[PDB]
CSV table of all heavy atoms in Angstrom, one decimal:
chain,number,residue,atom,x,y,z
H,85,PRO,N,-192.9,48.0,-77.7
H,85,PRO,CA,-194.4,47.9,-77.8
H,85,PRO,C,-194.8,47.0,-79.0
H,85,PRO,O,-194.1,46.8,-79.9
H,85,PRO,CB,-194.7,49.3,-78.1
H,85,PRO,CG,-193.6,50.0,-78.8
H,85,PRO,CD,-192.4,49.2,-78.3
H,86,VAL,N,-196.0,46.4,-78.8
H,86,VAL,CA,-196.5,45.3,-79.6
H,86,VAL,C,-197.9,45.5,-80.0
H,86,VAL,O,-198.2,45.7,-81.1
H,86,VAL,CB,-196.1,43.9,-79.2
H,86,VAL,CG1,-194.6,43.6,-79.2
H,86,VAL,CG2,-196.6,43.6,-77.7
H,87,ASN,N,-198.8,45.4,-79.1
H,87,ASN,CA,-200.4,45.0,-79.4
H,87,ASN,C,-201.2,46.3,-79.5
H,87,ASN,O,-202.4,46.1,-79.8
H,87,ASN,CB,-200.8,43.9,-78.5
H,87,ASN,CG,-200.3,42.5,-78.9
H,87,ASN,OD1,-200.5,42.2,-80.1
H,87,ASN,ND2,-199.8,41.8,-78.1
H,88,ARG,N,-200.6,47.4,-79.2
H,88,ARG,CA,-201.4,48.8,-79.5
H,88,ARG,C,-200.6,49.8,-80.1
H,88,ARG,O,-199.5,50.2,-79.5
H,88,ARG,CB,-202.1,49.3,-78.2
H,88,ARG,CG,-203.4,48.4,-77.8
H,88,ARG,CD,-204.4,49.5,-77.1
H,88,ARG,NE,-205.8,49.1,-77.3
H,88,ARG,CZ,-206.5,48.2,-76.6
H,88,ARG,NH1,-205.9,47.5,-75.7
H,88,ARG,NH2,-207.7,48.0,-76.8
H,89,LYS,N,-201.0,50.4,-81.0
H,89,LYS,CA,-200.3,51.7,-81.6
H,89,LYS,C,-200.6,52.7,-80.7
H,89,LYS,O,-201.6,52.9,-80.1
H,89,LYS,CB,-200.8,51.9,-83.1
H,89,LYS,CG,-200.1,53.0,-83.8
H,89,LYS,CD,-200.7,53.5,-84.9
H,89,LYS,CE,-200.0,54.7,-85.5
H,89,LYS,NZ,-200.7,55.0,-86.9
H,90,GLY,N,-199.6,53.6,-80.5
H,90,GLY,CA,-199.7,54.9,-79.7
H,90,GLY,C,-199.4,54.6,-78.3
H,90,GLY,O,-199.6,55.5,-77.4
H,91,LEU,N,-199.0,53.5,-77.8
H,91,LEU,CA,-198.8,53.0,-76.5
H,91,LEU,C,-197.5,53.7,-76.1
H,91,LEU,O,-196.5,53.8,-76.8
H,91,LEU,CB,-198.6,51.5,-76.5
H,91,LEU,CG,-198.2,51.0,-75.0
H,91,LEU,CD1,-199.3,51.1,-74.0
H,91,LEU,CD2,-197.8,49.4,-75.2
H,92,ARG,N,-197.5,54.2,-74.7
H,92,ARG,CA,-196.2,54.7,-74.2
H,92,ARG,C,-196.2,54.4,-72.7
H,92,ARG,O,-197.3,54.4,-72.0
H,92,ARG,CB,-196.1,56.3,-74.5
H,92,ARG,CG,-197.3,57.1,-74.0
H,92,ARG,CD,-197.8,58.1,-74.7
H,92,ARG,NE,-196.8,59.2,-75.1
H,92,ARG,CZ,-196.9,60.4,-74.5
H,92,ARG,NH1,-197.7,60.7,-73.5
H,92,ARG,NH2,-196.0,61.3,-74.8
H,93,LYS,N,-195.1,54.0,-72.2
H,93,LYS,CA,-194.9,53.4,-70.9
H,93,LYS,C,-193.7,54.0,-70.1
H,93,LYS,O,-192.8,54.4,-70.7
H,93,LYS,CB,-195.0,51.9,-71.1
H,93,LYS,CG,-195.1,51.2,-69.8
H,93,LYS,CD,-195.3,49.7,-70.0
H,93,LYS,CE,-195.4,48.7,-68.8
H,93,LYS,NZ,-195.4,47.3,-69.1
H,94,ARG,N,-193.6,53.8,-68.9
H,94,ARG,CA,-192.7,54.4,-68.0
H,94,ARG,C,-191.9,53.2,-67.3
H,94,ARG,O,-192.3,52.5,-66.6
H,94,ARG,CB,-193.4,55.2,-66.9
H,94,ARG,CG,-192.2,55.9,-66.0
H,94,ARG,CD,-192.8,56.9,-64.8
H,94,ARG,NE,-193.6,58.0,-65.5
H,94,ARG,CZ,-193.1,59.2,-65.7
H,94,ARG,NH1,-191.9,59.4,-65.6
H,94,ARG,NH2,-194.0,60.0,-66.1
H,95,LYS,N,-190.5,53.3,-67.7
H,95,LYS,CA,-189.7,52.2,-67.3
H,95,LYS,C,-188.2,52.8,-66.8
H,95,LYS,O,-187.8,53.8,-67.1
H,95,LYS,CB,-189.2,51.5,-68.6
H,95,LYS,CG,-190.2,50.6,-69.1
H,95,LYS,CD,-189.7,49.3,-70.0
H,95,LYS,CE,-190.7,48.3,-70.0
H,95,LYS,NZ,-190.0,47.1,-70.7
H,96,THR,N,-187.7,52.1,-65.8
H,96,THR,CA,-186.4,52.4,-65.2
H,96,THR,C,-185.2,52.1,-66.2
H,96,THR,O,-185.1,51.2,-66.9
H,96,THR,CB,-186.1,51.6,-64.0
H,96,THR,OG1,-187.3,51.4,-63.1
H,96,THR,CG2,-185.0,52.0,-63.1
H,97,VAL,N,-184.3,53.2,-66.2
H,97,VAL,CA,-183.1,53.1,-67.0
H,97,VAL,C,-182.0,53.7,-66.4
H,97,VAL,O,-182.1,54.4,-65.4
H,97,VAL,CB,-183.3,53.8,-68.4
H,97,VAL,CG1,-184.4,53.2,-69.3
H,97,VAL,CG2,-183.6,55.3,-68.3
H,98,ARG,N,-180.7,53.5,-66.9
H,98,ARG,CA,-179.5,54.0,-66.1
H,98,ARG,C,-178.9,55.0,-67.2
H,98,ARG,O,-178.8,54.8,-68.3
H,98,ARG,CB,-178.6,53.0,-65.7
H,98,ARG,CG,-177.6,53.5,-64.7
H,98,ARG,CD,-176.5,52.4,-64.2
H,98,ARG,NE,-175.5,52.9,-63.5
H,98,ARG,CZ,-174.4,53.8,-63.9
H,98,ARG,NH1,-174.3,54.1,-65.1
H,98,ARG,NH2,-173.6,54.1,-63.0
H,99,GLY,N,-178.2,56.0,-66.6
H,99,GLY,CA,-177.3,57.1,-67.3
H,99,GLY,C,-176.0,56.5,-67.8
H,99,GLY,O,-175.7,55.5,-67.4
H,100,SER,N,-175.4,57.1,-68.6
H,100,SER,CA,-174.2,56.6,-69.4
H,100,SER,C,-172.9,56.5,-68.7
H,100,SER,O,-172.0,55.9,-69.2
H,100,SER,CB,-174.0,57.6,-70.7
H,100,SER,OG,-175.2,58.1,-71.1
H,101,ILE,N,-172.9,57.3,-67.6
H,101,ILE,CA,-171.4,57.3,-66.9
H,101,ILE,C,-171.2,56.0,-66.1
H,101,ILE,O,-172.0,55.5,-65.5
H,101,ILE,CB,-171.6,58.6,-65.9
H,101,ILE,CG1,-171.6,59.9,-66.8
H,101,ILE,CG2,-170.3,58.6,-65.1
H,101,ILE,CD1,-171.7,61.1,-66.0
H,102,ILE,N,-170.0,55.5,-66.4
H,102,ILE,CA,-169.5,54.2,-65.9
H,102,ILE,C,-169.1,54.2,-64.4
H,102,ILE,O,-168.4,55.2,-64.1
H,102,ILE,CB,-168.6,53.6,-66.8
H,102,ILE,CG1,-169.2,53.4,-68.3
H,102,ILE,CG2,-168.0,52.2,-66.2
H,102,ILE,CD1,-168.1,53.3,-69.3
H,103,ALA,N,-169.4,53.2,-63.6
H,103,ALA,CA,-169.3,53.1,-62.3
H,103,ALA,C,-169.4,51.7,-61.8
H,103,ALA,O,-169.8,50.8,-62.6
H,103,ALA,CB,-170.0,54.0,-61.4
H,104,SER,N,-169.3,51.4,-60.4
H,104,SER,CA,-169.3,50.1,-60.0
H,104,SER,C,-170.6,49.3,-60.1
H,104,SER,O,-170.7,48.1,-59.8
H,104,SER,CB,-169.0,50.0,-58.4
H,104,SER,OG,-169.9,50.8,-57.7
H,105,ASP,N,-171.7,50.0,-60.5
H,105,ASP,CA,-173.0,49.3,-60.8
H,105,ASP,C,-172.9,48.5,-62.1
H,105,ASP,O,-173.8,47.5,-62.1
H,105,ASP,CB,-174.0,50.5,-61.2
H,105,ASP,CG,-174.2,51.6,-60.3
H,105,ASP,OD1,-174.0,51.4,-59.1
H,105,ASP,OD2,-174.6,52.7,-60.7
H,106,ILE,N,-172.0,48.7,-62.9
H,106,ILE,CA,-172.2,48.0,-64.3
H,106,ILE,C,-171.7,46.7,-64.2
H,106,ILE,O,-170.6,46.3,-63.7
H,106,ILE,CB,-171.3,48.9,-65.3
H,106,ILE,CG1,-171.9,50.4,-65.3
H,106,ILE,CG2,-171.4,48.3,-66.8
H,106,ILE,CD1,-173.5,50.5,-65.6
H,107,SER,N,-172.5,45.7,-65.0
H,107,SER,CA,-172.1,44.3,-65.1
H,107,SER,C,-171.4,43.9,-66.4
H,107,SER,O,-170.6,43.0,-66.5
H,107,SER,CB,-173.4,43.4,-64.9
H,107,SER,OG,-174.3,43.9,-65.9
H,108,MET,N,-171.8,44.7,-67.4
H,108,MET,CA,-171.1,44.4,-68.8
H,108,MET,C,-171.0,45.7,-69.6
H,108,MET,O,-172.0,46.5,-69.5
H,108,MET,CB,-172.0,43.3,-69.6
H,108,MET,CG,-171.5,43.2,-71.0
H,108,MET,SD,-172.6,42.1,-71.9
H,108,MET,CE,-173.8,43.4,-72.4
H,109,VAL,N,-169.9,45.9,-70.3
H,109,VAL,CA,-169.6,47.0,-71.2
H,109,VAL,C,-169.4,46.5,-72.5
H,109,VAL,O,-168.6,45.5,-72.7
H,109,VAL,CB,-168.4,47.9,-70.7
H,109,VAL,CG1,-168.2,49.1,-71.6
H,109,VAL,CG2,-168.4,48.2,-69.2
H,110,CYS,N,-170.1,47.0,-73.5
H,110,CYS,CA,-169.8,46.7,-74.9
H,110,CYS,C,-168.9,47.7,-75.6
H,110,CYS,O,-169.0,48.7,-75.3
H,110,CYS,CB,-171.1,46.7,-75.6
H,110,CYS,SG,-172.3,45.5,-75.1
H,111,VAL,N,-168.1,47.1,-76.4
H,111,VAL,CA,-166.9,47.8,-77.0
H,111,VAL,C,-166.6,47.4,-78.5
H,111,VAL,O,-166.8,46.3,-78.8
H,111,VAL,CB,-165.6,47.8,-76.2
H,111,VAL,CG1,-164.4,47.8,-76.9
H,111,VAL,CG2,-165.6,48.9,-75.1
Side-chain angles (χ1 to χ4, degrees):
Chain H
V86 287
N87 281 310
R88 276 209 153 85
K89 186 192 175 177
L91 173 69
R92 60 222 295 262
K93 194 169 165 186
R94 181 180 301 272
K95 288 203 157 189
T96 316
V97 298
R98 201 186 170 284
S100 329
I101 293 176
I102 299 159
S104 67
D105 299 338
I106 302 308
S107 59
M108 182 186 75
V109 184
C110 292
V111 147

